[PDB]
Structure 1
Amino acid sequence: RHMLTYGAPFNFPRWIDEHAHLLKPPVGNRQVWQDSDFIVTVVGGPNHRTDYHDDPLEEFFYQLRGNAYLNLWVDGRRERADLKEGDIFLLPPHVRHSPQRPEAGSACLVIERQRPAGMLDGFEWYCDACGHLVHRVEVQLKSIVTDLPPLFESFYASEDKRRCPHCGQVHPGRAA
């Protein structure tokens, strides 16, 4: 049997307007369709964050409204990829990325794939003093809204998780 499981086409700019109040703290983002293989999200702002995501699959970005940027590790060095309003970008698997979204009213279309069982996501923090990895957690990712907060929260709550194994500096946690 063949039906439109994810419903009919609809106007995207009006959808974003109607969901603006989720596109800001404390929720910040909203998945468009549920139970699909393509995970299609709109991400708003402001939001800053200190974690780097290690995604085993690609991520597509289209910065529809306002500006944002990705903090990256590429070739072993910190780098910044700007997502200016109107930019698209395709992130290869496993490139560590920390999205920074300073602007209220911004909106970024992000498209990712459901990860199959056994294909784990990583979330990493790095030492601001020496660049060493401080902590990494791997998760079988099923839902961004519900599987990521307890993970981030347990990092911020633990001086041990935040302690750099190389230089001893305790990572600040949330605001950095």
Structure 2
Amino acid sequence: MLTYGAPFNFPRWIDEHAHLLKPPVGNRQVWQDSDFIVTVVGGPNHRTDYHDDPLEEFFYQLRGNAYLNLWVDGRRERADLKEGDIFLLPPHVRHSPQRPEAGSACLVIERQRPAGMLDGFEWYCDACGHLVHRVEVQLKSAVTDLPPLFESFYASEDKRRCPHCGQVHPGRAA
């Protein structure tokens, strides 16, 4: 049977969920309990964390524009996601998505992680670029598994202290 229901109009679905594609929620998973994690991410949202995903991520920027701060080959880089752009991110490429536009919408597709395949979330020093803090997580549920992790980093000057230059990371926003 059609466990995930029948086909449905995507632009209409996005419009109808527009109130959830803005702060404080910012995103919405389309189907529940599926192998493919299909999410629409709106805006505005900025962030300071870099994700280390052990699997690929697919992006299709449907509405508005966004960009990904990356680390590529030891250097800091930016991949722009202009409206209409698609992108496939390889495993383990550190990325920090920035979505400054209200009313933007990006289709993001990931896969469920098998037991033992962990995700990393990392912060880097604005002053010297050294890794400041990394947490590895078995990522089941995104909604419960991630906010406390981010909160506890922002709450602690110890966690936020660069081990190489002692500069304390701004936490939630530079």
Deviation at 1:161, TM superposition (A): 0.3
Say how many residue pairs are matched: 174
Deviation at 1:144, TM superposition (A): 1.5
* Runs of 5+ consecutive residues of structure 1 not aligned to the other structure: none
Deviation at 1:145, TM superposition (A): 1.5
Distance 1:23 1:145 in 2: 14
Deviation at 1:101, TM superposition (A): 0.1
After alignment, is 98-107 or 142-151 more displaced? Answer: 142-151
Distance 1:143 1:40 in 2: 13
State the Cα deviation string for residues 59-102 of structure 1 (Å, max 9, x = none): 00000000000000000000000000000000000000000000
State the Cα deviation string for residues 33-84 of structure 1 (Å, max 9, x = none): 0000000000000000000000000000000000000000000000000000
Distance 1:98 1:83 in 2: 12
Deviation at 1:156, TM superposition (A): 0.1
Deviation beyond 3 Å, 4+ runs, structure 1: none
Distance 2:14 2:140 in 1: 24
Distance 1:31 1:94 in 2: 22
Distance 2:144 2:95 in 1: 20
* Runs of 5+ consecutive residues of structure 2 not aligned to the other structure: none
Distance 2:153 2:82 in 1: 31
Identity %: 99
**Root-mean-square deviation (Å):** 0.4
Distance 2:143 2:83 in 1: 25
Deviation at 1:146, TM superposition (A): 1.6
